[PDB]
Amino acid sequence: IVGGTASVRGEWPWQVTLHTTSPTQRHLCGGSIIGNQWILTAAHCFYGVESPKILRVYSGILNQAEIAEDTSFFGVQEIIIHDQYKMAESGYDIALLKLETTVNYADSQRPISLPSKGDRNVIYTDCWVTGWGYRKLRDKIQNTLQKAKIPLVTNEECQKRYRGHKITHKMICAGYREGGKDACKGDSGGPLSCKHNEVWHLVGITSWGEGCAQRERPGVYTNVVEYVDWILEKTQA
Numbered sequence: 381i382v383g384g385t386a387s388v389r390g391e392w393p394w395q396v397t398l399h400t401t402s403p404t405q406r407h408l409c410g411g412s413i414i415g416n417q418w419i420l421t422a423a424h425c426f427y428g429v430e431s432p433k434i435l436r437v438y439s440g441i442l443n444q445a446e447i448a449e450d451t452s453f454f455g456v457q458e459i460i461i462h463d464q465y466k467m468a469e470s471g472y473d474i475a476l477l478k479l480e481t482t483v484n485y486a487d488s489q490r491p492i493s494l495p496s497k498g499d500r501n502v503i504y505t506d507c508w509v510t511g512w513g514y515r516k517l518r519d520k521i522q523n524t525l526q527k528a529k530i531p532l533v534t535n536e537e538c539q540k541r542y543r544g545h546k547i548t549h550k551m552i553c554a555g556y557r558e559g560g561k562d563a564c565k566g567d568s569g570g571p572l573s574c575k576h577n578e579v580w581h582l583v584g585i586t587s588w589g590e591g592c593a594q595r596e597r598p599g600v601y602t603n604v605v606e607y608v609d610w611i612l613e614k615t616q617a
């Protein structure tokens with residue numbers, strides 16, 4: 381996260397940090413708890429991942445330092461990538477992680493509500509992006525979960541900022557015309573939580589962008605509401 385600040389512990393209870401143990405353990409991507417056994421994240425986050433066995437999901441984390449060899453985690457039973465996904469910039473950058481065990485909800489870890497179809501006309505004026513991504517291009521994985529408030533921009537406006545790209549209705553962007561605050565490397569898969577009427581909603585999934593926090597380069601996210609049907613279909617046994 382660029383231009384953000386340290387989060388309060390438990391402030392984003394749905395945020396998880398997805399680690400890979402290969403070659404040695406490290407943070408790979410962000411993710412969101414949406415069900416007792418389900419994490420919603422980005423599909424492109426599994427590039428080079430042949431098996432779910434090397435994945436570890438940690439919930440209720442603030443500082444990466446909290447994660448040690450003796451720290452409990454959730455194993456991943458299955459990685460479900462949207463069948464139309466090819467690459468982040470083309471859309472469909474969404475994936476579901478079915479955990480091997482159920483998450484016991486608590487103040488430190490609980491699910492975020494998915495947006496409803498009857499909410500595409502809602503004016504989210506309180507949206508935040510979080511994760512342990514780069515604070516800058518040449519940076520590394522930050523220890524403390526960062527957060528940054530960022531306004532959503534219309535798709536027409538976003539398309540203007542990305543000429544060589546095709547910004548579809550299945551994407552949603554957020555950023556400051558002048559830049560300064562944005563997601564960055566490592567925040568991928570993270571949630572773009574928006575508070576609408578006292579209730580937090582998972583509006584987007586951190587996907588891509590030209591660089592990080594550059595002026596006139598909004599962050600691009602997966603427009604979650606466009607996938608509620610897909611999510612329902614893939615989560616039902």
Ligand SMILES: *[C@](=O)([C]([C][C][C][N][C]([N])[N])[N]C(=O)[C]([N]C(=O)[C]([C][C][C][N]C([N])=O)[N]C(=O)[N][C]([C])C1=[C][C]=C(Br)[C]=[C]1)[C]([C])[C])C1=N[C]=[C]S1
Nearest residue numbers: 424468563564565566567568587588589590591592593599
């Ligand atoms: C994810 O954490 C990041 C999240 C990026 C969110 N960005 C903002 N600003 N909100 N995702 C990526 O790194 C993805 N790639 C890119 O975002 C960009 C796309 C550029 C397209 N530009 C134009 N104008 O066409 N690519 C990119 O940065 N590529 C270089 C080679 C790169 C260098 C170092 C690292 Br780390 C990643 C990419 C990925 C490629 C889909 C992460 N997902 C994986 C690692 S971080």
